[PDB]
Amino acid sequence: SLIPIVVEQTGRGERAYDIYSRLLRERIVCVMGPIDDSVASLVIAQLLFLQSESNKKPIHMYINSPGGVVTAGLAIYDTMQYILNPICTWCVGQAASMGSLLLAAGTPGMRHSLPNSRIMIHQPSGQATDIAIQAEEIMKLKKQLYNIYAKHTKQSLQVIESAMERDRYMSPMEAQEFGILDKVLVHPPQ
Amino acid sequence: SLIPIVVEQTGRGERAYDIYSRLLRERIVCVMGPIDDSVASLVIAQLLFLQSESNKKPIHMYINSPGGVVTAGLAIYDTMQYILNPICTWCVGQAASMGSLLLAAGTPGMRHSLPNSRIMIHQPSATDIAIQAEEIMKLKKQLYNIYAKHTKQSLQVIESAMERDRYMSPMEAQEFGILDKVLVHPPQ
């Protein structure tokens, strides 16, 4: 609906930003809602732009999302790997399906959730492919997901596949034990 | 889709672009989603403009597309050939149907993909106006020649490959002649 404008002051002000462009200036990429090609393209453009401004300054990925198109989520994931910057992922609300894959892919140590978030590793039976897909192709995608969760949760493929069978959400504390995120934060530390 | 505005520091002060116009300043052309006449219109306009500014500086085409209208894809492919610039193609997510043709058509050695993308050359199921059977067969053969030209494979290997309803991995696509390099991280 209406997006607010805020005013910041710089060595050349005044200046006006829409609140989201403002947050992008602090190197915050909002990943909100169902992930599809258009979201993946907007997110990837932010990541590339931010690394081009500094490939060393961290990048903060706020994730509140129920999942999305697998190939679109994987484009985001692959671009998180490719850029150099440390990536902090911050889960607010929920990270389900490809959402929690992006949550788990932040730089080790820098993956957080708020305390009332819900994290889900299970895949839904809201599209998951662009075009209609053969059975062997959907198994290849699910094995691509199996490998990625395993690498980033430091769990075994067997433990991952068993977990993704369960149609449940985890608490942020469970998701941390399992290796999906690192710290649950009620308040800023120290 | 609220497109964010970024501010960069060019000559001689500071100007504000929407983030996609900013990528076009780096000679990057995004090919996202199903390819139709409008997409082909904008992409061609960008390739024409970018060569207009330099006919030597490489042009980078980032592809995440499941396919689309065959004539529109061909319009892009032909302007890729006409213009003189080198063209890196970069595949994120997927390149399928006409998308993987544009992928295959980047200048040799400069065709890339990320490691989890999916590439399909099988055709789905195109066409702005419903067409006769001999016309769809003439287009499929235009596709066969283009794929065989840029993959350095034989028409017969292309044809029986496109009959397989499957995606390849980026590795397979490179062994087959669609890609040159699969990069997880930037090279040394």
Binding site: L48, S52, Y82 | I28, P58, H60, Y62, W90, M110, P186
Partner: peptide, 6 residues
């Protein structure tokens, strides 16, 4: 996607 494209 730099380096190398651009």
């Amino acid at each position: 996607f730099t380096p190398x494209a651009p």
